[PDB]
């Protein structure tokens, strides 16, 4: 089963997640098909806080990927009319 | 030159042996340390150098040079062995670590005290 999920990179007390498409049986930092965008939870207001390419995400939705709760919250953050 | 000879038989790098056969690259070894006696050196020295034949814990029979001024060794008192040739005693390729196990440090030393294991002058 494919899924779109965060990967938990960064340092101790310095999180930096990687939204990525991967199988559920693989590891969190393990093998992935391809990466699309990123998220930084400590990215308070500066030049860039979140990049997220919606084309490949819509392509993986067209394939059957299960979106997790944080990635769905990022989809509701990157709104089509906002 | 003559590259076809290198095609048949490649240029084999010499594997030089180590100066201290210390069983797969370890810093120190711990031995039984018997046979405490003095050894007169080679020709331009004319001295009496203290030495000990150290039966190591891996089966090897090495002989390490006893450094420092005075020691408490008598056929016993397990010590620590470090590498390095002595260039004064042929057959001796090792040194004794002072401040280590049972051989105590050198009495009344102030300068060069990390080597030979002497503490800081307390007074």
């Amino acid at each position: 089963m494919v899924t779109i999920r965060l990967a938990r990179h960064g340092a101790k007390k310095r999180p930096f997640y990687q939204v990525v498409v991967a199988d559920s049986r693989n590891a969190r930092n393990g093998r992935f098909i391809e990466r699309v965008g990123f998220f930084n939870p400590i990215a308070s207001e500066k030049e860039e806080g979140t990049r997220l390419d919606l084309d490949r995400i819509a392509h993986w939705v067209g394939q059957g990927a299960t979106i997790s709760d944080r990635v769905a919250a990022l989809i509701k953050e990157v709104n089509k009319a906002a | 030159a003559t590259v076809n000879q290198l095609v048949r038989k490649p240029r084999a790098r010499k594997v030089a042996k180590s100066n201290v056969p210390a069983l797969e690259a370890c810093p120190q070894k711990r031995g039984v340390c018997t046979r405490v006696y003095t050894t007169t050196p080679k020709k331009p020295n004319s001295a009496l150098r203290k030495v000990c034949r150290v039966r190591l814990t891996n089966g090897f029979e090495v002989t390490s040079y006893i450094g420092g001024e005075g020691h408490n060794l008598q056929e016993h008192s397990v010590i620590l062995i470090r590498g390095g040739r002595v260039k004064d005693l042929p057959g001796v390729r090792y040194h004794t670590v002072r401040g280590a196990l049972d051989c105590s440090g050198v009495k009344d030393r102030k300068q060069a005290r990390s080597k030979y294991g002497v503490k800081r002058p307390k007074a």
Binding site: - | V32, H76, S77, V78, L101, D102, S104, K122, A123
Partner: protein, 130 residues
């Protein structure tokens, strides 16, 4: 009472650890002199056959048969307040002895040395540890 002189001197670490395990107890308090040999077993009783039988365990393999060596009176434990016990360590630096729990009593060979120690005036926030 007497000493530790470590017959079969291989692997001292079972007594450098396992008797320090017994040094926190009320019966046994191990005393370490500076010269790194001749470690004193503390006994408040007389029969030290308890520790000698206890030296035949899974992590206890050294014998240390006893003899007669005279060290007299109890090593009165004292750790004085700062800036003042430093020169007390400095003047007789060959006359200290580590204890079980990193203490330094004075050294006890006779009553006259304890009288000289009381003459030396070690003002102390006193704790007995006994």
């Amino acid at each position: 009472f007497r000493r530790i002189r470590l017959k079969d001197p291989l692997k001292q670490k079972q007594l450098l650890k396992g008797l320090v395990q017994l040094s926190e107890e009320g019966a046994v308090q191990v005393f370490r002199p500076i010269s790194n040999n001749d470690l004193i077993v503390g006994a408040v009783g007389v029969l030290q056959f308890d520790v000698v039988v206890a030296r035949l365990k899974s992590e206890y393999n050294v014998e240390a048969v006893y003899e007669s060596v005279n060290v007299a009176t109890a090593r009165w434990v004292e750790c004085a307040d700062a800036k003042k016990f430093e020169e007390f360590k400095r003047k007789n630096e060959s006359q200290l002895a580590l204890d079980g729990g990193d203490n330094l009593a004075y050294i006890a060979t006779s009553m006259v040395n304890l009288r000289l120690a009381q003459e030396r005036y070690p003002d102390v926030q006193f704790h007995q540890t006994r």
